Ligand binder design. Structure first.
Ligand SMILES: [Zn+2]
Ligand SMILES: [Zn+2]
Length: 81
């Protein structure tokens, strides 16, 4: 089996028949790992809660949506003021 490593828990994910997907689900931790680049103008962001998020490449901050999380993610440094 073609296998990719889950980016969250490092379990092996069997990707037979799934290489056409953008992401694959890990059955162990129930999180998604990206298999392709985010679509153009987007980037994949991993929340500290382990949720895989999509952001625009122009986004400076994204909020996680998971109800238990709602974390703010700083996708870059800022300047003072
Ligand atoms: Zn996993
Ligand atoms: Zn989160």
């Amino acid at each position: 089996a073609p296998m990719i490593t889950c980016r969250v828990c490092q379990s092996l994910i069997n990707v037979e028949g799934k290489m056409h997907q953008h992401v694959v689900k890990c059955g162990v931790c129930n999180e998604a790992t990206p298999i392709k680049n985010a679509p153009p103008g987007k980037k994949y962001v991993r929340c500290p809660c382990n949720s895989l998020l999509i952001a625009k490449v122009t986004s400076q901050r994204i909020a996680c949506p998971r109800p238990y999380c709602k974390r703010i993610i700083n996708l870059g440094p800022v300047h003072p003021g």
